[PDB]
């Protein structure tokens, strides 16, 4: 279901992309979440949260903290106490 590319996690339905999140390393220690979007047809299903979660597990492994620039990503960070020890500003 959730696939990985260079600076991205995405999901494809026939192979059409119905969700993505795009993140960018700066320095050796930071990453930015620039963009997350999910097709409007999936809107109920928590897919955005799940995509943010993947970027977080990845950045935890690679010892990078995350600046959640995308408003949606930023929203997730504000709710999730678990992401406090991985946030930077
Ligand atoms: Ni799935
Ligand atoms: Ni895109
Ligand atoms: Ni809400």
| CATH classification at residue 4 | 3.40.630.30
* Cα separation, 18 vs 1, whole angstroms: 11
Beta-carbon contacts of 72 under 8 Å, excluding residues fewer than 6 positions away, are 36, 48, 52
Q: How far is the CA of 27 from the centre of ligand 3 (A)?
A: 32
Q: How far is the CA of 54 from the centre of ligand 1 (A)?
A: 12
* Cα separation, 15 vs 30, whole angstroms: 32
Domain hosting 51: range is 1-89
CB contact at 8 A, 48 and 67? no
Number of domains in the chain: 1
Q: How far is the CA of 37 from the centre of ligand 2 (A)?
A: 8
Q: How far is the CA of 70 from the centre of ligand 2 (A)?
A: 13
- Structure determination method: X-ray
Please choose, from the candidates 82, 77, 32, 40, the residue with its C-alpha nearest in 3D space to the C-alpha of residue 21. Answer: 32
Q: Which one of the ligands is nearest to 76 CA?
A: 3
């Amino acid at each position: 279901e959730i696939r990985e590319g260079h600076n991205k996690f995405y999901i494809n339905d026939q192979g059409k992309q119905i969700a993505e999140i795009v993140f960018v390393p700066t320095g050796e220690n930071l990453a930015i979440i620039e963009h997350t979007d999910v097709d409007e047809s999936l809107k109920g299903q928590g897919i955005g949260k799940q995509l943010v979660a993947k970027v977080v597990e990845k950045m935890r492994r690679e010892k990078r903290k995350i600046i959640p620039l995308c408003p949606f990503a930023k929203h997730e960070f504000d709710k999730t106490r678990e992401y406090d020890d991985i946030r930077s500003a």
